[PDB]
């Protein structure tokens, strides 16, 4: 029985021919005050998973601690911890989805929406969502909060169905993700211009880009808008 205080907005992601990409801005809002500008909401787990989290930040920080523990505890009496018995995206997801649902069933949820993006050991892309209610779903594109409304329509024009995944390159995917992030800075009042993006590819592995900024914005047309109807000057 709680209410979120410091919050993170959208986490968007989509899967492409050889991997998945996920991004989330670096803001931690306190209501309408864009309070903290250096919050990383993308959490890499090992070298094959990135968990993006929106929602309550104190709870995200808790989920972070939990993930670091899973890694420590999986290395225990595990000679193959950095190989065959390393944490897979599907393991990290199922674990989180379990916690989320248990917490909702005790009426004390972790006020978050999470997307686990990654690549399985056999090459399969993994992209799955889980939120404060334990609800889970998978799709070629996944976005939380505001991004579900504005990013999905855009990312879906690139990958509308399963067959479209093998026809999409990292270049195309990253371009779409980057554009969605710009649209969100335009229309989401709780967004930040600074963001992070992560690509998990079956060949090149994990590439994590920090300190990205929305660029190439169109604001010039504003010079010609005056009044709200009849004003001429």
């Amino acid at each position: 029985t709680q209410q979120p205080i410091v919050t993170g907005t959208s986490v968007i992601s989509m899967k492409y021919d050889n991997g998945v990409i996920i991004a989330a801005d670096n803001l931690g809002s306190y209501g309408s005050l864009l309070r903290f500008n250096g919050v990383e909401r993308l959490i890499p787990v090992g070298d094959n998973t990135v968990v993006g989290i929106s929602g309550d930040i104190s709870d995200m920080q808790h989920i972070e601690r939990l993930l670091k523990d899973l890694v420590t505890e999986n290395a225990y009496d595990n000679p193959l911890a950095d190989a065959e018995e390393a944490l897979e995206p599907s393991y990290i997801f199922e674990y989180l989805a379990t916690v989320m649902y248990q917490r909702r069933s005790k009426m004390n949820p972790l006020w978050n929406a999470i997307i686990v993006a990654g690549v399985q050991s056999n090459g399969d892309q993994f992209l799955r969502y889980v939120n404060l209610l334990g609800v889970t779903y998978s799709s070629p594109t996944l976005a939380t909060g505001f991004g579900a409304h504005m990013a999905n329509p855009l990312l879906r024009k690139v990958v509308d169905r399963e067959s479209d995944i093998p026809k999409t390159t990292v270049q195309v995917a990253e371009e779409a993700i980057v554009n969605a992030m710009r649209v969100l800075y335009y229309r989401d009042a709780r967004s930040s211009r600074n963001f992070s993006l992560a690509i998990i590819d079956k060949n090149t592995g994990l590439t994590f880009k920090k300190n990205l900024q929305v660029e190439n914005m169109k604001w010039d047309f504003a010079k010609d808008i005056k009044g709200y109807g009849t004003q001429k000057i």
Binding site: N78, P79, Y91, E94, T98
Partner: peptide, 15 residues
């Protein structure tokens, strides 16, 4: 299987 969707390692079972 239920919690991690992972098959338990024999080495782990032994431990």
């Amino acid at each position: 299987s239920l919690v991690f969707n992972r098959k338990l390692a024999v080495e782990r079972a032994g431990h």
